[PDB]
Amino acid sequence: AKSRHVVICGWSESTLECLRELRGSEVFVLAEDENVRKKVLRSGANFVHGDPTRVSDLEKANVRGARAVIVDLESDSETIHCILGIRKIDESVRIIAEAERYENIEQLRMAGADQVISPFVISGRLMSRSIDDGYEAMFVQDVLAEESTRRMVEVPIPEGSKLEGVSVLDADIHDVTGVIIIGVGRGDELIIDPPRDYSFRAGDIILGIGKPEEIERLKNYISALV
């Protein structure tokens, strides 16, 4: 949870939405196609005209000691290539990549990716599941894309939180706040539906779903004792 700069390698629709979500932070977009420059600037970010597979260009984009580097190239091959180059410059910087083919997630990880996201798998699955209803899709589309009614959130548990050492069962988060708790994160591991007898700890990241008002309630509920 730092506040350095972010580097985005490659341009695509993903990168565009992603850049929107970062509207209000210093971002550097490294890309070959010069056309894109306009769009990147007209969005607050800094454009760095270059090649993400070229280590010298990655350097010019300030990949070293960056808060995180996001990669989404025109090819899983190029993404793997870019990543390799990144690790050469900084072997600790957090790397998030987009995989187009499922079979490449592993290789992407082996290259140095800290988090891999596979949109087509997600898409193809939602589609095959919408041949009769659209409920699952509607849900995903509403919470993960248009973030309409609800939204998915990560809420860190401060040191001295009111839920410090409180079991899931006793916290009664959903009924008190309206937020559906879907998981707890500790040491970059994730317990999907944590057991009622699970106690919280400072540092833990509660993963829930809820409307902005319910998320705000949860945040007050998580607060540290005054």
Added chain:
Amino acid sequence: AKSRHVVICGWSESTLECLRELRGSEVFVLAEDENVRKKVLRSGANFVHGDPTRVSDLEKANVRGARAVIVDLESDSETIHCILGIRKIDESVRIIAEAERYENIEQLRMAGADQVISPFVISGRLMSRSIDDGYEAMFVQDVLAEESTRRMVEVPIPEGSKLEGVSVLDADIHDVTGVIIIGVGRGDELIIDPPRDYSFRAGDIILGIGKPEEIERLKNYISALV
């Protein structure tokens, strides 16, 4: 909830995963690039060499009276074009499409799409949200992509179900089955986090998340009285 055939227009990673999910049903894949033929056949589906923007080719793919038609072309423009052609052949057939740009979802709908999925928005968002943790991503990736531990499911409420006319609160589904109920679907509408005082009805589709064993428990719990 019928059992006719499915038509997939266009080829891509989405289409490939989607075709996997339909492994065990009669599917027709309409595509221009002949290379793909091998992959489609080596997956149980029928390949139809043609152009999805051409109404005569859509016909050869049995788009008429199909259970559902899934569209994912090399362009939102082409997807809109394909859809228009589809409505010309059958104005009632369920259409599921993939939008690459957010601004096209509406136009895609106006063209005739019954359900639109936007993978890049979903992707770009997950990425911008993973610059420090990967919990949200891990969750999505695990339940929506690799469907590892948990999986998302739609469970229809049979006529005469044991939960017929039972309020959410009284059903106590999560504690009894272990499945996290995230929403109810009725008349192609979706109530994300239905209120405790909401009663179920036959026809309703419960949308939850759970492990295969928990989903099976829920299915027994939903059953109609003998």
